[PDB]
Amino acid sequence: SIHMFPSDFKWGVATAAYQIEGAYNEDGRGMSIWDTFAHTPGKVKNGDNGNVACDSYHRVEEDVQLLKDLGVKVYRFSISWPRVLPQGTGEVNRAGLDYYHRLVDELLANGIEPFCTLYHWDLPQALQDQGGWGSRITIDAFAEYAELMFKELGGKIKQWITFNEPWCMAFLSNYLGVHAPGNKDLQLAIDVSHHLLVAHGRAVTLFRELGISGEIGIAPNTSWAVPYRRTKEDMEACLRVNGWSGDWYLDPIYFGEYPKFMLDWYENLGYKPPIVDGDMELIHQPIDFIGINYYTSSMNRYNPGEAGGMLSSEAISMGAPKTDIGWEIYAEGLYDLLRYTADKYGNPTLYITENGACYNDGLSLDGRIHDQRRIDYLAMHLIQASRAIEDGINLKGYMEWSLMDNFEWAEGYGMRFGLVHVDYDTLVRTPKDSFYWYKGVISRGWLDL
Amino acid sequence: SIHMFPSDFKWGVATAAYQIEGAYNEDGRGMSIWDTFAHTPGKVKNGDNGNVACDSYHRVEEDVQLLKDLGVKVYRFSISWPRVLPQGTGEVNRAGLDYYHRLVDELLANGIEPFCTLYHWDLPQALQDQGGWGSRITIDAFAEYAELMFKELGGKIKQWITFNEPWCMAFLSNYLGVHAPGNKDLQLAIDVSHHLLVAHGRAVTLFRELGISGEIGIAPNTSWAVPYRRTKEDMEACLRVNGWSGDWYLDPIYFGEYPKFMLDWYENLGYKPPIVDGDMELIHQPIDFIGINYYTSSMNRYNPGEAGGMLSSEAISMGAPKTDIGWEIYAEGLYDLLRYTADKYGNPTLYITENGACYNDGLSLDGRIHDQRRIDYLAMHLIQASRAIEDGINLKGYMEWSLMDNFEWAEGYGMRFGLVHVDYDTLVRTPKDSFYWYKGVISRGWLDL
Amino acid sequence: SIHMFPSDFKWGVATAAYQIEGAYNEDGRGMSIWDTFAHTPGKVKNGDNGNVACDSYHRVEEDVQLLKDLGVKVYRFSISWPRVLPQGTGEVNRAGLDYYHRLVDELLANGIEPFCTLYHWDLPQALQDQGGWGSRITIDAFAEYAELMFKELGGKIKQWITFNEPWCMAFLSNYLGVHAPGNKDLQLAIDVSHHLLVAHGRAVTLFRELGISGEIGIAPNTSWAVPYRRTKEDMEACLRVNGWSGDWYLDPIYFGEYPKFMLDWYENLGYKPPIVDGDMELIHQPIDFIGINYYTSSMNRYNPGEAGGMLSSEAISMGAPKTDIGWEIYAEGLYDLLRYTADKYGNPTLYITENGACYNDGLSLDGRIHDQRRIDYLAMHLIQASRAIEDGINLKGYMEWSLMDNFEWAEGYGMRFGLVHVDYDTLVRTPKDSFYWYKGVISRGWLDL
Amino acid sequence: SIHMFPSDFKWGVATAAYQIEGAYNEDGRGMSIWDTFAHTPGKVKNGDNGNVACDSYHRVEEDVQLLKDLGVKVYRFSISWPRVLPQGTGEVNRAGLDYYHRLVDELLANGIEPFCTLYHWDLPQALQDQGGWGSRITIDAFAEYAELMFKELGGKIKQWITFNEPWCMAFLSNYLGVHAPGNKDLQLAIDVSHHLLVAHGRAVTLFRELGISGEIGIAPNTSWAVPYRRTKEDMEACLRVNGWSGDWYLDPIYFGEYPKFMLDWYENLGYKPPIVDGDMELIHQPIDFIGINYYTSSMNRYNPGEAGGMLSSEAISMGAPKTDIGWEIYAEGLYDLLRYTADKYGNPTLYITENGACYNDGLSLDGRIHDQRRIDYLAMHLIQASRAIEDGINLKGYMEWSLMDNFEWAEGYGMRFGLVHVDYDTLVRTPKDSFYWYKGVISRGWLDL
Structure with a gap:
C-alpha cells in the first residue's frame, strides 16, 4: 500500500549536543549538570559519560557527510549552553560558537536546513550551583543565552526550538531523580516547569524583536495513554498523562493558562506553580x-x-512487542497524539522532532547491521504520519531520532537509537540497514508497504 | 501486569469436522461440497484434501486426551452433515452418529463441556446437486438435520451453534469463489446468506420446541475495520466491512430486519435478498x-x-506484523469488535468461538515446537479479552482456534493454526509450547504479562 | 500447471530379486551369476553383494506395508530363477515358490496388482557353467522355467515380463564386462541377444497355449540419443544408439526380423546373430x-x-545437471522415446516399467530424508508422461524405479534409487520425502507443477 | 567434452543506459519514460529507480577496467537518448555526448570493440508527451537521433543496433502495461511496433547514406516455444509465440512484409498495423x-x-529448474532459435546480444560470490552456441547479459543478472565467480565441460 507524503515534506534526522559532541573539557567548555551527573558514581549505567561520546565536535565533516548521504533536508541539533557561555552568563566562549558556525555553514553548503534546539538538558553547572531551574535567575540567563544565539546563528538558522522535552528536564530530573540534577521533589519539578516556560516566552519575544526571519517553537514529549475501560474516570486518568507532560506546557503558551484539570489535581495535593504576576502573559x-x-x-x-x-x-x-529499551510499540498513538494536538491547538504547524526505536543490533560478520526491527518500527510510524496528513493534520515534517548511536543519558551507551552504528571503543561509524532504508523513503517521498 | 478472568470463565479450544476427522469415505459418509472441491484439480493448494486430515475419526481417545491434558473446560467441534445424513436428508447413517456419541461421551466423562456446531461448511453434495444453499429446499434439509442432532445429542450437549462464519460459507464461497462450491455471483451469495438465516431461525425454533435445555446461537466472523481518516465517508466505509460480514446476519436475528445501510448499498447495485413473506419473522x-x-x-x-x-x-x-498466513496483528480490534457487538445487540452473552494465529513452526532438533509467536499473539488477544470483561462486556468464554494443525481449506495443510503440531506424513501429534502455555493460563485463570 | 493422468492409469513401483531379497544361501536357493560375480574380488564396488540386501525375503509383510502406504496400484518384482529351480532346470525348490506365493497373496489381499518379471539378470550358475546364454540349451531351460511360473503364479498374476533390459544382460554383461558374467566379446553379446529373444518367443507361445489370462511383454532400456547436428550421419549415429539397445529386440518380435541398419552395421564389422532356421518365427x-x-x-x-x-x-x-550416479537429466527424452516407439510399433500398450533418479540423500538430524532432487526429477518426467498421453500415445502406466534403496549391481550399495531409505547396517527402512510426494501424486491422479 | 569456438569469435558482455548509468538529473539529461515510470508509486518494486543505479556515468574508468579484466573483445552498451537530446529533438546536449565519447575512447584504447545500441527503451519524456511511439512524429525524432549518433560516434563505432527487444518496448510496455509507458492496448502496441520498424528502416538508410563503415542490425528477443503435442494446432500455437515477438519485426525487414500468419491472427481480432503507403519499403x-x-x-x-x-x-x-527470477532453464531452445532464424532468414550473421541468468547470490563471508548456478547456466548455453556453429549456423559472437548487477526494470534491484556483484547501498563492485569463469572461457576460446 502506498503511503504518500507532500512534495514539500521536511525529511530530517536529529541529535543532541551532550549525546554526540564529546570534547566536554575542550576549548573552554564549561561543565553542565550532565557532566556532573554522569561523573557521579551510580548515576549512569556502567559509569558512562559524554566525555567523548561520538566525538562529533572533531568530526563536523563526517557528520555532514552522513547527512548528505542520507539525503536529509533538515538536521535538528542542539547548542551546548556551557560551550558558548561556560558560566551560563557573561563571558562568551568564541571557540564554542566557532564550532556551531562551522557546522551550520557545512549544512547550508550542502543544502541541509538547520533546525537548532537551544536547550537539550545541558544546563551550565554554574547556574545549577545558584539553584538551577529552581531559581528565577536562570530565566534571565536563558534569555541572555537565547539572544546571543539568535544574533550569532539567527542569520543562517530559520528553525528554532527553545526547550526539548520539558517534562523530562523538569519531572524526570527533579521529581523522579532519574536525570540530572537528580532531585525528588514534585514542587521543585513544578517550579522548573514554570521557570522554563517563562524563559521560553521571553526567548520567543526576543526572537520577534530581533526581527530574525524563521520559525520558533517548543518540543514536548507529550506522553500518550489509551483508556482501558470506556469510563469517565479512565478517560480522565489518561488525560492527566498527556496533561502533565504536554498540556502543562502548551496551554500556557497557546491559551495563557495552565490546564485547569491539572491545576486542580496538583492543588488538591498541595502543589501550585510559582506564578509571579505577569509570568503567564510572558x-x-x-x-x-x-x-x-x-x-x-x-x-x-x-x-x-x-x-x-x-x-x-x-x-x-x-x-x-517492545523495543530493546523496553518500550511497547503502539504506532497508532502517533496518529492519536497528532490528532489531539491538531484539535486542541487549532491545527498548528507540526513537526515530528523525534521518533525512533531502541534496537541494539550490532555488526554481523556480514559487516553490516541488519536492523530490520528498526525499519519495521519506522515504517509503521511513517504510515501513521501519512495517515495524519491524509486526515487534514498540518504535519509538515518528520525527523527520526538519532542519526547515530549515542550516549543514551542514564542508560549510558548500551541502548542504540541511531541509523548509523557507532562502535564506542573504536569510534568507527557504520551505516545500518535502516539508514539506507530511510534514505530511500526520503528520496521517493512515499512508502510502498 | 495481571490480566484477570472470571472464575466461571469458559476456557476452551475448537476444531471442525472436515478439517480434522478424515475417513471421508468410511462408514457410509456421503461426500460434501468440500470433498468435491478439494478433489478438483487447482482448487486447493498442492491438491490437498481432507481425506485423512488428522484422522480424528479413528482417534477419539487421542483427541480427548489432548483436551484433558490442556485442561480445557469446553470443546467446540462440528458435526459432519454428510456423515449423519449422507444425502442431506432421509436415510440416517447411524455409524456416523455413533462416532459423535462416542466423542461426546468421552468429553462428558472427562468433565469437558461439548460445544456443538451444526454447520461448518460441509454441505452434503447431494443437496448441492439440487442447488445447494441457493435453493430453499436446503432450508428444509437443514431443519431436518438440526432436529435430528437435537434429538440425538441434545441430552448431552447444552451448547449449540447453527452456522459458523456465515460470510465465509456465503460470500467467500459463492461470490469470491475461493471456498466450496466456488461460485462468483454476488446475488447468489446474498441468496445463500438469506437461506442460511432462515434455516438458522427454524433450527432455533425447533431447539425451543424440543424443550432441550441449553444455549443456541450463531458464530459470525464479523470483519473489523478502522477508519483511516476521521471522515464520515471513511467511517461508513468501515461500517460496511463489519456490516456485510456480521451485521447482515445478526440484525435479522435481533431486530428482524437486514441492516438498512447494507440493504441500500446492495439495492443501489441491483441486489436484494430473496425474502419470501414470513422469512424475516422466522x-x-x-x-x-x-x-x-x-x-x-x-x-x-x-x-x-x-x-x-x-x-x-x-x-x-x-x-x-503479520502471521504466517499474511494477516496483520491488530489485537485491539478484538476489544473494538466486542465493544461494538455489546453496544448494538444489548450486551448479550458473548463467546470468542475462534481466535488464533497461523504460525508454521515445526519441530526443532529439540523435539519441541518453540512457537513463541503464537504465545505472544494469544497473550495479546487474551489481554484484550480481559479488557472487555473489565469494561463490562458480557464475554463468558474463549476458545482458541485449532487444537491441532489441520486442513486449512484452500490453503491445504501448509498453514498451521494449532496448539498441537501434526506431522501429516506420519500423523504424529506433538504438543507445541503454546499448548503448555495455554494450559497454564487456563489453570491460573489469569495472565501475568 | 495441471498435468492430468487417466482415471485407469496404473501407478506403481518396481524392484528386482537379487537387489532386495537377500537370503541368497537359504531355503535351497541356488547361486546365480550375480552371486558369483559379486563374490569375485574387484567385480563390485567395495566388495558388496546381495547376500542380505534389504532382507525382503524375510520381510514380505514390511514390503507390502510400504506398498499399501504408498497407495500403489501395481507392484513390479522379479522371480529369482535359482530360488525356484536351483540348477536352472529339473528339481523344483518349493520353498522358493512358497515365498513368491506368499508375496503375491499379500499383494492381492491389499488390492495391489502383481507385475511379474521372469528374468532380471539372475541366471542360475549351473546354466552358466554350461555356457549360459551363449548356449541354446539355456533357451530350453528358460522355457521350462517360464512354464513353471505360468502354472504356479499364472492364476494370480496377469502382468508378465519375460526379460528386463535385454541390452544390459547381453551387451553390458558379455561385451563390456561390467555386469555378470563379465565377458568382453561382441559376438557373444549378439549370441546372447538372439538366444534370449528365442527364449522370450517360446515363453510367449507357452503363455498363450496355457490359456492363462493376462498380458505379457518385454522391457527394453532403449537408450535415447539426440542429433548434435541436423546431419544424416548424426541422425543415423543416434538411430544406432536406440537401435542396438531397443530396436534390436523389438523388431524381431514385431516384424520378425532384426533391424536392417543394425544388421548391416554388425555385418560390416564381421558380426551376425546365430539364427537357426525357424528362430525368427519363434x-x-x-x-x-x-x-x-x-x-x-x-x-x-x-x-x-x-x-x-x-x-x-x-x-x-x-x-x-546429473544425478548422483552421473547421468544427465533430459526429461524430454522420455517423450521422444515414447513417441518413437508409438510411431514405429503401431502405438501398442506402453508401461514405463522403470524410471527414477539416483540421489544418495541420507537422513537429516530431522529424522527424514529431504530428497527434493528426486521429487523434481520424477515430477519432470511425469510431466513428459502426461504429455505423451495428451499426444495420443498409449501409455497405460508408470512404475518408478526402486521402492527402496537396494544393491545397485556393480555400484554396490553406494547409489540410492529408492523412495524408501534403507540403512544397510541396521536394515532400518525410512520413507523419504519422495515417497510421500509420489503417494500424493498417485492419490490425486494429477500433478500441480 | 571440448566445445570449440572459432578463433575470430566475438566474446563480449552487455549493459543498458538506464540500468547502470545513474546521474539521471545531471549534465542536462532529460527525463525518459522510465524515469517517469520508476518515479510513479507502485510501478516498480520497492519504489526503485535508475537515479543512481551503478553510477557508471561517473565510473567510466571502473567500467572499462572490469571489461579489460574480463578479457572481453566486444562491449555492448546503449545511448541514453534524453542525455544527448533532452527533448528528443532539437537542442544537443554536448555534455552527454562527451560521456559516450570518453567511454568509447577508453574502450578503443584498451582494444575493446564498441557495440552501440541506439534505443534501449529510454524514450525522452518530451516525445512521450506528444504520443510517444504511438505518433509518427517520433519516427522523425529517432531518424534525427540516429543521424546525430552516426555522425558523432560513427567513426569509432562499427557495430550498431537500432532497437533492442522490440517486443518488450512495444507489447510488454503498451499492451501488458508492465513496462514504461505502461499502457494496455493491443492496437497501440501494434502501432508502436510499426513505427519503431519504420524508424529502424530510416536509420539503416541513413547509416548507408553516411557511408560510415561497419554493421547495423536489430536485436529481437524472439520468444521460443516447443509443441506440447505433435499436432498442427500446437505447432501453429508455438509459431505465433516466436511470430509476435520476432518474426513480426524481422519479416518486414528481410521480406518487406509482416508475417502472414500473424497478420491474419490480428486481423481476425480486428487489429492491423497502421501501414502508411511507402512504409514497408522503408x-x-x-x-x-x-x-x-x-x-x-x-x-x-x-x-x-x-x-x-x-x-x-x-x-x-x-x-x-528455474532462475531466481522464475524463468525455466531450456538451453536447447537457444540452438532451436538460432536454427530457426538461420533457416528462415538465409543464415545471416548472428550475434547473441543477450544471454544470462538471474541468480541473486550475494557475498559469502568468504568475501566472494560463489554463483555456480550462473556458471552452469552459461556453460549449458555456450554448449548450445558451439553446437549451432558446428551445425553450420553463422553465429559470430556471444555477449552475456549484464556485466554487473543493475536496475532490473520493474523488478527493481532485487534481481541480479551480472557477472560483477554490485552492492547498491555502498555501490561497491565485486567480481563474482562467474566473472572469472567467463574470463577463462574467453581466454581459452573453448570449453571443457
Whole structure:
C-alpha cells in the first residue's frame, strides 16, 4: 500500500549536543549538570559519560557527510549552553560558537536546513550551583543565552526550538531523580516547569524583536495513554498523562493558562506553580510550530492506590512487542497524539522532532547491521504520519531520532537509537540497514508497504 | 501486569469436522461440497484434501486426551452433515452418529463441556446437486438435520451453534469463489446468506420446541475495520466491512430486519435478498449468545474506484506484523469488535468461538515446537479479552482456534493454526509450547504479562 | 500447471530379486551369476553383494506395508530363477515358490496388482557353467522355467515380463564386462541377444497355449540419443544408439526380423546373430505391451574414430545437471522415446516399467530424508508422461524405479534409487520425502507443477 | 567434452543506459519514460529507480577496467537518448555526448570493440508527451537521433543496433502495461511496433547514406516455444509465440512484409498495423546482422480459452529448474532459435546480444560470490552456441547479459543478472565467480565441460 507524503515534506534526522559532541573539557567548555551527573558514581549505567561520546565536535565533516548521504533536508541539533557561555552568563566562549558556525555553514553548503534546539538538558553547572531551574535567575540567563544565539546563528538558522522535552528536564530530573540534577521533589519539578516556560516566552519575544526571519517553537514529549475501560474516570486518568507532560506546557503558551484539570489535581495535593504576576502573559507568546516527540503510548485506568501513582493513572501492559529499551510499540498513538494536538491547538504547524526505536543490533560478520526491527518500527510510524496528513493534520515534517548511536543519558551507551552504528571503543561509524532504508523513503517521498 | 478472568470463565479450544476427522469415505459418509472441491484439480493448494486430515475419526481417545491434558473446560467441534445424513436428508447413517456419541461421551466423562456446531461448511453434495444453499429446499434439509442432532445429542450437549462464519460459507464461497462450491455471483451469495438465516431461525425454533435445555446461537466472523481518516465517508466505509460480514446476519436475528445501510448499498447495485413473506419473522428468533470469531482487522478508507471494491472500502496496510498466513496483528480490534457487538445487540452473552494465529513452526532438533509467536499473539488477544470483561462486556468464554494443525481449506495443510503440531506424513501429534502455555493460563485463570 | 493422468492409469513401483531379497544361501536357493560375480574380488564396488540386501525375503509383510502406504496400484518384482529351480532346470525348490506365493497373496489381499518379471539378470550358475546364454540349451531351460511360473503364479498374476533390459544382460554383461558374467566379446553379446529373444518367443507361445489370462511383454532400456547436428550421419549415429539397445529386440518380435541398419552395421564389422532356421518365427510372437525403462538420453554425433566407439556415435556433454550416479537429466527424452516407439510399433500398450533418479540423500538430524532432487526429477518426467498421453500415445502406466534403496549391481550399495531409505547396517527402512510426494501424486491422479 | 569456438569469435558482455548509468538529473539529461515510470508509486518494486543505479556515468574508468579484466573483445552498451537530446529533438546536449565519447575512447584504447545500441527503451519524456511511439512524429525524432549518433560516434563505432527487444518496448510496455509507458492496448502496441520498424528502416538508410563503415542490425528477443503435442494446432500455437515477438519485426525487414500468419491472427481480432503507403519499403532495408536475445523458452499447446490468451497458445510447465527470477532453464531452445532464424532468414550473421541468468547470490563471508548456478547456466548455453556453429549456423559472437548487477526494470534491484556483484547501498563492485569463469572461457576460446 502506498503511503504518500507532500512534495514539500521536511525529511530530517536529529541529535543532541551532550549525546554526540564529546570534547566536554575542550576549548573552554564549561561543565553542565550532565557532566556532573554522569561523573557521579551510580548515576549512569556502567559509569558512562559524554566525555567523548561520538566525538562529533572533531568530526563536523563526517557528520555532514552522513547527512548528505542520507539525503536529509533538515538536521535538528542542539547548542551546548556551557560551550558558548561556560558560566551560563557573561563571558562568551568564541571557540564554542566557532564550532556551531562551522557546522551550520557545512549544512547550508550542502543544502541541509538547520533546525537548532537551544536547550537539550545541558544546563551550565554554574547556574545549577545558584539553584538551577529552581531559581528565577536562570530565566534571565536563558534569555541572555537565547539572544546571543539568535544574533550569532539567527542569520543562517530559520528553525528554532527553545526547550526539548520539558517534562523530562523538569519531572524526570527533579521529581523522579532519574536525570540530572537528580532531585525528588514534585514542587521543585513544578517550579522548573514554570521557570522554563517563562524563559521560553521571553526567548520567543526576543526572537520577534530581533526581527530574525524563521520559525520558533517548543518540543514536548507529550506522553500518550489509551483508556482501558470506556469510563469517565479512565478517560480522565489518561488525560492527566498527556496533561502533565504536554498540556502543562502548551496551554500556557497557546491559551495563557495552565490546564485547569491539572491545576486542580496538583492543588488538591498541595502543589501550585510559582506564578509571579505577569509570568503567564510572558509565556503567552505565539509560537510558529509544535515539536512532537513520539516513541510509545500506554493503556491506563484510574487507580487511587499506589499502582495509580501521583496521577492515580495505572498503566496496564498491552502485551505488545517492545523495543530493546523496553518500550511497547503502539504506532497508532502517533496518529492519536497528532490528532489531539491538531484539535486542541487549532491545527498548528507540526513537526515530528523525534521518533525512533531502541534496537541494539550490532555488526554481523556480514559487516553490516541488519536492523530490520528498526525499519519495521519506522515504517509503521511513517504510515501513521501519512495517515495524519491524509486526515487534514498540518504535519509538515518528520525527523527520526538519532542519526547515530549515542550516549543514551542514564542508560549510558548500551541502548542504540541511531541509523548509523557507532562502535564506542573504536569510534568507527557504520551505516545500518535502516539508514539506507530511510534514505530511500526520503528520496521517493512515499512508502510502498 | 495481571490480566484477570472470571472464575466461571469458559476456557476452551475448537476444531471442525472436515478439517480434522478424515475417513471421508468410511462408514457410509456421503461426500460434501468440500470433498468435491478439494478433489478438483487447482482448487486447493498442492491438491490437498481432507481425506485423512488428522484422522480424528479413528482417534477419539487421542483427541480427548489432548483436551484433558490442556485442561480445557469446553470443546467446540462440528458435526459432519454428510456423515449423519449422507444425502442431506432421509436415510440416517447411524455409524456416523455413533462416532459423535462416542466423542461426546468421552468429553462428558472427562468433565469437558461439548460445544456443538451444526454447520461448518460441509454441505452434503447431494443437496448441492439440487442447488445447494441457493435453493430453499436446503432450508428444509437443514431443519431436518438440526432436529435430528437435537434429538440425538441434545441430552448431552447444552451448547449449540447453527452456522459458523456465515460470510465465509456465503460470500467467500459463492461470490469470491475461493471456498466450496466456488461460485462468483454476488446475488447468489446474498441468496445463500438469506437461506442460511432462515434455516438458522427454524433450527432455533425447533431447539425451543424440543424443550432441550441449553444455549443456541450463531458464530459470525464479523470483519473489523478502522477508519483511516476521521471522515464520515471513511467511517461508513468501515461500517460496511463489519456490516456485510456480521451485521447482515445478526440484525435479522435481533431486530428482524437486514441492516438498512447494507440493504441500500446492495439495492443501489441491483441486489436484494430473496425474502419470501414470513422469512424475516422466522429468522427473528431470540438466540442465547453470539459467537465472536476474531483474527485480524484492517484500516479502511472510502474509495469509489476499483481499489475500494464492491463496498468501496479500500484497506490500507498498517505495516503491522503479520502471521504466517499474511494477516496483520491488530489485537485491539478484538476489544473494538466486542465493544461494538455489546453496544448494538444489548450486551448479550458473548463467546470468542475462534481466535488464533497461523504460525508454521515445526519441530526443532529439540523435539519441541518453540512457537513463541503464537504465545505472544494469544497473550495479546487474551489481554484484550480481559479488557472487555473489565469494561463490562458480557464475554463468558474463549476458545482458541485449532487444537491441532489441520486442513486449512484452500490453503491445504501448509498453514498451521494449532496448539498441537501434526506431522501429516506420519500423523504424529506433538504438543507445541503454546499448548503448555495455554494450559497454564487456563489453570491460573489469569495472565501475568 | 495441471498435468492430468487417466482415471485407469496404473501407478506403481518396481524392484528386482537379487537387489532386495537377500537370503541368497537359504531355503535351497541356488547361486546365480550375480552371486558369483559379486563374490569375485574387484567385480563390485567395495566388495558388496546381495547376500542380505534389504532382507525382503524375510520381510514380505514390511514390503507390502510400504506398498499399501504408498497407495500403489501395481507392484513390479522379479522371480529369482535359482530360488525356484536351483540348477536352472529339473528339481523344483518349493520353498522358493512358497515365498513368491506368499508375496503375491499379500499383494492381492491389499488390492495391489502383481507385475511379474521372469528374468532380471539372475541366471542360475549351473546354466552358466554350461555356457549360459551363449548356449541354446539355456533357451530350453528358460522355457521350462517360464512354464513353471505360468502354472504356479499364472492364476494370480496377469502382468508378465519375460526379460528386463535385454541390452544390459547381453551387451553390458558379455561385451563390456561390467555386469555378470563379465565377458568382453561382441559376438557373444549378439549370441546372447538372439538366444534370449528365442527364449522370450517360446515363453510367449507357452503363455498363450496355457490359456492363462493376462498380458505379457518385454522391457527394453532403449537408450535415447539426440542429433548434435541436423546431419544424416548424426541422425543415423543416434538411430544406432536406440537401435542396438531397443530396436534390436523389438523388431524381431514385431516384424520378425532384426533391424536392417543394425544388421548391416554388425555385418560390416564381421558380426551376425546365430539364427537357426525357424528362430525368427519363434521370436515373432505378438506381445501385449512394451515396457519402457527410461532414465536419461544423450546428444550424439557421427565419429569414425575411437571417440565414436563400435557404433561410431560419439556422445557430447550437454552440460546438463546429473544425478548422483552421473547421468544427465533430459526429461524430454522420455517423450521422444515414447513417441518413437508409438510411431514405429503401431502405438501398442506402453508401461514405463522403470524410471527414477539416483540421489544418495541420507537422513537429516530431522529424522527424514529431504530428497527434493528426486521429487523434481520424477515430477519432470511425469510431466513428459502426461504429455505423451495428451499426444495420443498409449501409455497405460508408470512404475518408478526402486521402492527402496537396494544393491545397485556393480555400484554396490553406494547409489540410492529408492523412495524408501534403507540403512544397510541396521536394515532400518525410512520413507523419504519422495515417497510421500509420489503417494500424493498417485492419490490425486494429477500433478500441480 | 571440448566445445570449440572459432578463433575470430566475438566474446563480449552487455549493459543498458538506464540500468547502470545513474546521474539521471545531471549534465542536462532529460527525463525518459522510465524515469517517469520508476518515479510513479507502485510501478516498480520497492519504489526503485535508475537515479543512481551503478553510477557508471561517473565510473567510466571502473567500467572499462572490469571489461579489460574480463578479457572481453566486444562491449555492448546503449545511448541514453534524453542525455544527448533532452527533448528528443532539437537542442544537443554536448555534455552527454562527451560521456559516450570518453567511454568509447577508453574502450578503443584498451582494444575493446564498441557495440552501440541506439534505443534501449529510454524514450525522452518530451516525445512521450506528444504520443510517444504511438505518433509518427517520433519516427522523425529517432531518424534525427540516429543521424546525430552516426555522425558523432560513427567513426569509432562499427557495430550498431537500432532497437533492442522490440517486443518488450512495444507489447510488454503498451499492451501488458508492465513496462514504461505502461499502457494496455493491443492496437497501440501494434502501432508502436510499426513505427519503431519504420524508424529502424530510416536509420539503416541513413547509416548507408553516411557511408560510415561497419554493421547495423536489430536485436529481437524472439520468444521460443516447443509443441506440447505433435499436432498442427500446437505447432501453429508455438509459431505465433516466436511470430509476435520476432518474426513480426524481422519479416518486414528481410521480406518487406509482416508475417502472414500473424497478420491474419490480428486481423481476425480486428487489429492491423497502421501501414502508411511507402512504409514497408522503408522498413525493407538490408541489415548486416540479427541480434539474438535468449534466456528461456516454453512448451505450448493450442487453447481457444482464456488459458491460451490472445494468441490462444497456453504454456505448460516442464517442471524444469528455474532462475531466481522464475524463468525455466531450456538451453536447447537457444540452438532451436538460432536454427530457426538461420533457416528462415538465409543464415545471416548472428550475434547473441543477450544471454544470462538471474541468480541473486550475494557475498559469502568468504568475501566472494560463489554463483555456480550462473556458471552452469552459461556453460549449458555456450554448449548450445558451439553446437549451432558446428551445425553450420553463422553465429559470430556471444555477449552475456549484464556485466554487473543493475536496475532490473520493474523488478527493481532485487534481481541480479551480472557477472560483477554490485552492492547498491555502498555501490561497491565485486567480481563474482562467474566473472572469472567467463574470463577463462574467453581466454581459452573453448570449453571443457
